[PDB]
Curated annotation (Swiss-Prot):
It comes from Streptomyces coelicolor (strain ATCC BAA-471 / A3(2) / M145). Gene3D superfamilies: 3.30.530.20. Involved in developmentally regulated synthesis of a compound biosynthetically related to polyketide antibiotics which is essential for spore color in Streptomyces coelicolor. InterPro entries: COQ10_START, START-like_dom_sf. It comes from the Bacteria. To polyketide cyclases. This is Putative polyketide cyclase. CDD domains: TcmN_ARO-CYC_like.
Length: 172
């Protein structure tokens, strides 16, 4: 691989845009497969109470997200769509029901490095003019919560990789 990476690193910055990367010490196939197994997100991520696949059109997958209750106790739920391309190791998603946003576009990209798989998440959005918070606020909130979720995904995938390795080394 000959490039190196490590840890959780912000990239780019500007309100309405977030860009963060994390290195996960696991091979690309495992990282790709677990992060894209969206019905198991509630066990991988800590932020979704449930993820339900609604349909697939060719590759476009359409799905409904339901969060845990927010600080006011409210439960937010919406439909998004995503196209995951394993050849370019890129996923492009957007909210279909935009909620308090005018739009929200989320791109995930993956590559290999000497330390494992780097996964970079970029989000672009703008709040509706009458939304309860502004872009600056939402930008800081998404950065902070992304950082927490990326780290938890890193931990759970490194755990899974370790367990599969132990099973294989102990098997005949």
């Amino acid at each position: 691989h000959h490039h190196h990476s490590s840890g959780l690193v912000p990239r780019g910055h500007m309100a309405g845009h977030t860009d963060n990367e994390i290195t996960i010490a696991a091979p690309m196939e495992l990282v790709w497969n677990m992060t894209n197994d969206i019905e198991k997100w509630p066990g991988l991520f800590s932020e979704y109470a449930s993820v339900e696949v609604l349909g697939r059109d060719d590759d476009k997958v359409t799905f409904r997200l339901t969060m845990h209750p927010d600080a006011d106790g409210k439960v937010w739920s919406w439909v998004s769509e995503r196209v995951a391309d394993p050849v370019t190791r890129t996923v492009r998603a957007q909210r279909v029901e935009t909620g308090p946003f005018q739009y929200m576009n989320i791109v995930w990209e993956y590559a290999e490095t000497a330390e494992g798989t780097v996964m970079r998440w970029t989000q672009d959005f703008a709040m509706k003019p009458d939304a309860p918070v502004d872009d600056a606020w939402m930008t800081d909130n998404i950065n902070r919560n992304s950082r927490t979720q990326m780290a938890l995904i890193r931990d759970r995938i490194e755990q899974a990789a370790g367990e599969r390795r132990t099973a294989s080394v102990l098997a005949d």
